[PDB]
């Protein structure tokens, strides 16, 4: 089963899919291939929940039903910063204009 | 065993003849046609009597009252009409169906008419008022035939949905659905004259005799062709005990009711034989054929 | 393997290159591409469409609806008209 | 043209609506004219009575958006050898992003107020180029 994800940190969003049965650690390897930082320097999140390397994505709550291609699920990403980790911080997308009169 | 031979060809309709019915008193033959006309003929000599007109589109079926005075007809124009046969006048037009009306019959008392339509409903009508007394949500596909049993207490209907259903006339309640593992469209149904059995045609070249009380099939009749048209069949009871039906190979088929073997095939029509009728007292068959023929034929047997 | 599509408001969207080639424009424009006129609440939805399109094209598993909130329809229409996808 | 043939050979069909739309089956009669039939709620099926050689297409019932049936535009009941009803699986096509955008806008603005919009004037034409079945029938037969 495929899950469809947005991995987000600051003003960065990675669109990727993964298997429900694949691990958090394997997802960090995807991030590493793109953003250089090794798995040990990453923290992945579902909302405010720190995800453990050895859990599967299914076990964290990412499933085919909750993580769809047209509506992917968000994974938060935080990097090591010197002695500790930065706080989780996802910048919101731009806001939509008010609905014109016709709607 | 029987020896039906052709005696008269009745010519006059200008399109397919849909239905032939002998009057219950044996004197008359009524025919209906895609040409929107009803015609009356002498039952023994074939002599043309009169033409009855009024419907706006073709007619599928016509039926006599018990006293041979009234006719009801069922039309693609979505109505039925009640006719005074001696004057040829339309007494009532029964309106209510939302699509083609395919079949009709009086009850034995002849105070009620039953009708079935492409619109999947069966309706019960008051002969005197012309008002619809009951609309039964009878089937989920076109209704091909409706028939009252011998005392008017039950109605049997057949439908392209594969079912025959038996209805209580007074309450409108479905008392029994005849269902089998295989459900091809049911193209015709009729109670036997004693009301204990039901003859059903299906669009797989098969006629079946059902036991109403047990709800189980007792006999099948095959060898004819029937995959397209809703062909009318009959019990022949005046001489030997036959089943009679038309056929898409332009023949009338006659089977031995008990043994189920074909005993005669009548050749003469030039198109599909879609209607047959059996005289109430004499060994006489009426048969009617489609657009490449347009005639009724009368055949007589010595038994 | 991947390309980076950058919105007008600086958000950086990283998507599979094959997925970005869904847009005929992006094929020509193309690694990195800036969209000076398309903000992030629209470009993110365009990326979702890329995912949806590639996943459900030539498949017979039941196709769901691509959802579009009313507030983003016009810009997305303009983005889609611009992107030729 | 594209028209049903009067085969008179009955054929049972399951109209199976595997789409999120209310589906409107359209029968092309023996003169090729489109006839609308009762609609199917999303995610429902109905066995129906039709005929060999009869032509059907399927649309969104409120907007006339074209839909797929067995992965194509037109459905004709074919040879049946097993006695089972033939499945007509109705599904959503993968609409272009633009086309799906037009669909959502059309659903929110009345066609009087189409040109009361802050959009490139060229897309005005695309909004009012609605899907209609006759437009496709000329398309389908000219293919």
Residue numbers in the entry:
A (entry chain J): 1 to 103
B (entry chain A): 32 to 334
C (entry chain K): 17 to 46, 58 to 112
D (entry chain L): 62 to 204
Q: What do the paper's sentences say?
A:
The chromatin-associated WD40 repeat domain protein 5 (WDR5) acts as a functional subunit of the mixed lineage leukemia (MLL) histone methyltransferase complexes (1–3). WDR5 adopts a donut-shaped propeller structure, containing a WDR5 interaction (WIN) motif that binds MLL1, and another cleft known as the WDR5 binding motif (WBM) site that mediates protein-protein interactions (PPIs) with a diverse set of non-MLL partners such as c-MYC. PROTACs simultaneously bind the protein of interest (POI) and an E3 ligase such as von Hippel–Lindau (VHL) or cereblon (CRBN) and hijack the cellular ubiquitination-proteasome system, leading to selective polyubiquitination and subsequent degradation of the POI at the proteasome. Here, we present pharmacological degradation of WDR5 as a promising therapeutic strategy for treating WDR5-dependent tumors and report two high-resolution crystal structures of WDR5-degrader-E3 ligase ternary complexes.
On the basis of the crystal structure of an initial WDR5 degrader in complex with WDR5 and the E3 ligase von Hippel–Lindau (VHL), we designed a WDR5 degrader, MS67, and demonstrated the high cooperativity of MS67 binding to WDR5 and VHL by another ternary complex structure and biophysical characterization. As anticipated, MS67 had VHL and WDR5 closer than in the MS33 ternary complex, resulting in a more extensive protein-protein interface. Compared to the WDR5-MS33-VCB ternary complex, there was a greater preponderance of nonpolar interactions at the VHL-WDR5 interface, as exemplified by Tyr191 and Leu234 of WDR5 making nonpolar contacts with His110 and Pro71 of VHL, respectively. Several new hydrogen bonds were also present, including ones between the side chain of WDR5 Asp172 and the side chains of VHL Arg107 and Arg108. Unlike the MS33 ternary complex, there were substantial cross protein-ligand interactions, wherein WDR5 made contacts with the VHL-binding portion of MS67 and VHL made contacts with the WDR5-binding portion of MS67. The methyl and t-butyl groups of the VHL-1–Me moiety were involved in hydrophobic contacts with Phe149, Pro173, and Tyr131 of WDR5, and conversely, the fluorobenzyl ring of the WDR5-binding moiety made van der Waals contacts with Tyr112 and His110 of VHL. Together, the more extensive VHL-WDR5 interface and the cross protein-ligand interaction were expected to increase the cooperativity of the WDR5-MS67-VCB complex. Furthermore, the WDR5-MS67-VCB structure also confirmed our design for enhancing WDR5 binding. The methyl substituents we introduced at the 2- and 4-position of the methyl piperazine group were able to fill in the hydrophobic cavity where the methylpiperazine group sat and the fluoro group added to the phenyl ring interacted with Phe133 and Tyr191 of WDR5.
